[PDB]
């Protein structure tokens, strides 16, 4: 691993940081609220009497299992353009509340039912918010919206005094003030009704054909979920590193009994990373704390690769009464789980060191380790040795009231000093 982290078949004496160890998860768990009833969609789509666009019919969907895999045959689905969640990955999520706003509009306006759009229908009839998350579904309806004479049934709004805020209905049987005369229902000269109809026939061409469009808007946010996908929840496991899929929130870690004070309107915990720390069990209503799996960095202490091929592995800041001392298959990210883990395990204030043995004797140290501990390569028959570094040769002075030490000789020593003065000049 050391030879692989830096491109070389020879590694010089020292300590090298190679990678990190982290306990891998054992088995995955999914926990959704136990819902058996199904929210029907047949009456949502298979109905020939949908409302117009200035008053679109909004259906709130409630506690159910949203298996959106059998609806694709209830309409042609000319366009299934969806924002937020990708269309395919909907069956594996849980939503707070979902609203189906259905209506029928003119074809040229189908692209106008979108976040942040402007025009006749996105300013005066039905405005979609800029941060809209949800799906939009549109298709044709010419099979029945056709008469030999006319279909005087559908309506929309032309003139409004001001643009309406997103998600607002504006039903109003009022007469617009055209011109200056404030007519009170004359509806004659300079007073026209603010709504026009949708008489339709098969004779009319493409683009003006009625497009039936339903938008499904979901508030995928932190709240007790109401509608969920078709996943069979499994049993809960605690104090053991697993993958959890808590009510649509996926992650890895250990779940422990938590003593927090989740208020009834709260469902998720949070720390300062915008990552979930605590979560309540959806079908138990118990507060359990999520702690990420044990991990740390590994440093490889090597003597000269020409001297020996044995190494000493240091786990930084880890108390290895944990899984390092009792390691098993498929539990650690490093595949080299071949240590006996029974001998030459020394605990260091920088994390325990395995592969080297501590001794009481102290020397000046070659390979630094940390926290006053160092490593070297020593004889008895040869091994990597760990010890507290020796600061210097302890000695004493002979201080006294009337004692002075005077040298009688000298030496002219020629030491050396090396100082960089400049580096290479580079242009690009």
């Amino acid at each position: 691993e050391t030879k692989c982290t830096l491109k070389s078949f020879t590694v010089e004496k020292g300590i090298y940081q190679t990678s990190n160890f982290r306990v891998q998860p054992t088995e995955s768990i999914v926990r959704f609220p136990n819902i058996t009833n199904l929210c029907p969609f047949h009456e949502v789509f298979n109905a020939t009497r949908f409302a117009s666009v200035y008053a679109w019919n909004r259906k709130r969907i409630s506690n159910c299992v949203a298996d959106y895999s059998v609806l694709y045959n209830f309409a042609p689905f000319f366009a299934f353009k969806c924002y937020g969640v990708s269309p395919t990955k909907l069956n594996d999520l849980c939503f707070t509340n979902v609203y189906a706003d259905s209506f029928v509009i003119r074809g040229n306006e189908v692209s106008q039912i979108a976040p942040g759009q402007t025009g006749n229908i996105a300013d005066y009839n039905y405005k979609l918010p800029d941060d809209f998350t949800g799906c939009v579904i549109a298709w044709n309806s010419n099979k029945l919206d056709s008469k030999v004479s006319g279909n005087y049934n559908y309506l929309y709004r032309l003139f409004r005094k001001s643009k309406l805020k997103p998600f607002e209905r504006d039903i109003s049987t009022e007469i617009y003030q055209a011109g200056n005369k404030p007519c009170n229902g004359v509806a004659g000269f300079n007073c026209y009704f603010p709504l026009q109809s949708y008489g339709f026939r098969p004779t009319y061409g493409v683009g003006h054909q009625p497009y039936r469009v339903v938008v499904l808007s979901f508030e995928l946010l932190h709240a007790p979920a109401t509608v969920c996908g078709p996943k069979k929840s499994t049993n809960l496991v605690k104090n053991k590193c697993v993958n959890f899929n808590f009510n649509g929130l996926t992650g890895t870690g250990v779940l422990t009994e938590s003593n927090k004070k989740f208020l009834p309107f709260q469902q998720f915990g949070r720390d300062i990373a915008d990552t979930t720390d605590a979560v309540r069990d959806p079908q138990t209503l118990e507060i359990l704390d999520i702690t990420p799996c044990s991990f740390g960095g590994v440093s490889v202490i090597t003597p000269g690769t020409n001297t020996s091929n044995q190494v000493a592995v240091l786990y930084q800041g880890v108390n290895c009464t944990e899984v390092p001392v009792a390691i098993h298959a498929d539990q650690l990210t490093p595949t080299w789980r071949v240590y006996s883990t029974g001998s030459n395990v020394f605990q260091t204030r920088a994390g325990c060191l395995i592969g080297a043995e501590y001794v009481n004797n102290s020397y000046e140290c070659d390979i630094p380790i940390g926290a006053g501990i160092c490593a070297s390569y020593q004889t008895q028959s040869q091994s990597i040795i760990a010890y507290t570094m020796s600061l210097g040769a302890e000695n004493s002075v002979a201080y006294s009231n009337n004692s002075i030490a005077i040298p009688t000789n000298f030496t002219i020593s020629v030491t050396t000093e090396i100082l960089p003065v400049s580096m290479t000049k580079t242009s690009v």
Binding site: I272, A273, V318, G370, L391, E394, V397, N401, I404
Partner: protein, 330 residues
């Protein structure tokens, strides 16, 4: 660690980040260089003596009271009372001591390695330096340590600044009392002042705030749908999860590069300060400096080093003139 900080335990994000090349091996190498530089700084400043000297068991230095700067064997840490006050006055954020609440909120590859030299052997370097400078003068800064009575050493430190030996040998009681009073009141002034170790506290707090801000960067969407990558991989298909994860990669990697560059500049400044401290220890302590206003204010006499969390404190004993008189001169 890029592998865990930028991407949280996700194979897809790590694979996508692998395309960016050496934008993460460079960061690890730079941080390792910074750590090695800080390991070398303490050795440069303190490890100036080949051996370690111990004071004689008897403590009489001609009336000079050094009990406030020598280690106290009764204390568990074997530190000087002034060193203990310095340790108490400066509070460290993290030290990386077998951790296995804000520091606990760093399950993001942000690990504070512990220093090579514990503050038990740094105290030993300080004690050796101070014992050498009280029991051998500056002679141990050149070659072998040569014993000399402290009154003689102080007389020659006077002779260094242009006042003859007789001044000390005729006012020794007065100089001893003044030095003892100054050493006694420096502790009181240091403790009573609301913040005297401002520089070391700023050094600690700057790193603490840098790590805090780096942690808080994970809560930033960076123009993505969400600031947590386990949601994007569970909310979007791989074709668009690619783009969103890449945007998060760019944002978090830019924040990490900014952090590393700021750490490099801060480490350069700290290295300059440590080189100044090493020069000050070599000249003020292991000798007498004739440079004006280098070792304190006034004609410098001597200096005593003391350890402190991520720093050093020099006690500069200096000779300051006093009440003067006019005279007619030719």
């Amino acid at each position: 660690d890029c592998t865990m900080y930028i991407c949280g335990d996700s194979t897809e994000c790590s694979n996508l980040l692998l395309q960016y090349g050496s934008f993460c091996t460079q960061l690890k190498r730079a941080l390792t260089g910074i750590a090695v530089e800080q390991d070398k700084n303490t050795q440069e400043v303190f490890a100036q003596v080949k051996q370690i000297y111990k004071t004689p068991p008897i403590k009489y230095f001609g009336g000079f009271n050094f009990s406030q700067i020598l280690p106290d064997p009764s204390k568990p840490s074997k530190r000087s009372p002034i060193e203990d006050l310095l340790f108490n006055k400066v509070t460290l954020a993290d030290a990386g001591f077998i951790k296995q609440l804000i520091c606990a909120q760093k399950f993001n590859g942000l690990t504070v390695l512990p220093p090579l030299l514990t503050d038990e052997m740094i105290a030993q370097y300080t004690s050796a330096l101070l014992a050498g400078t009280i029991t051998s003068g500056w002679t141990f800064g050149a070659g072998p340590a040569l014993q000399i009575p402290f009154p003689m050493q102080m007389a020659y430190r006077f002779n260094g600044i242009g006042v003859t030996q007789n001044v000390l040998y005729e006012n020794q009681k007065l100089i001893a009392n003044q030095f003892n009073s100054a050493i006694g009141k420096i502790q009181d002034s240091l403790s009573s002042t609301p913040s005297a170790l401002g520089k070391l506290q700023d050094v600690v707090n700057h790193n603490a705030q840098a790590l805090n801000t780096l942690v808080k960067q994970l809560s930033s969407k960076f123009g993505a749908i969400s600031s947590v990558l386990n949601d994007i991989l569970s909310r979007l298909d791989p074709p668009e999860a690619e783009v969103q994860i890449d945007r998060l990669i760019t944002g978090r990697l830019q924040s990490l590069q900014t952090y590393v560059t700021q750490q490099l500049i801060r480490a350069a400044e700290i290295r300059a300060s440590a080189n100044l401290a090493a020069t000050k220890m070599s000249e003020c302590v292991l000798g007498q400096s004739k440079r004006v206003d280098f070792c304190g204010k006034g004609y410098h006499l001597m200096s005593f080093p003391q350890s402190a969390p991520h720093g050093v404190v020099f006690l500069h004993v200096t000779y300051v003139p006093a009440q003067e008189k006019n005279f007619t001169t030719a």
